[PDB]
């Protein structure tokens, strides 16, 4: 019953932002920022 909304909302908003700045590359290519955004989907999948 603590103010949980004003933290999980910011977490899901940061998850949305990390979904947005993801760059889709053709044919199995990747860059540096796309690798650090999959290690961030372990901080966003463990909180939820």
């Amino acid at each position: 019953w603590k103010p949980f909304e004003t933290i999980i909302l910011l977490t899901i908003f940061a998850n949305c932002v990390a979904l947005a700045v993801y760059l889709p590359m053709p044919e199995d290519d990747n860059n540096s920022l796309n690798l650090g955004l999959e290690k961030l989907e372990y901080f966003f999948l463990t909180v939820f």
């Binding site: 590359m25 053709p26 044919e27 199995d28 290519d29 990747n30």
Partner: protein, 96 residues
Amino acid sequence: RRPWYIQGAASPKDMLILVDVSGSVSGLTLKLIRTSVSEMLETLSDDDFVNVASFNSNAQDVSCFQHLVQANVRNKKVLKDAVNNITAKGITDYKK
């Protein structure tokens, strides 16, 4: 692009053409890279030496040659036919 001009403009060369065949080049830029490598091979003479390599998370010779060859009409034919068979897939690794 005339042989006499290229011959009198600069000394012979040891060219190595390093081509990027990672995934990001698929589409228009791979086709342009193929045409560009062919047009670059057409500026070489029999005193120059050449080899075409290709890298995507792994670097390998694009042809059967494995080192610098003499850049005559037959060797350049081989290199052109080997370049025109390139397909784009993988990760880009400039260090390799």
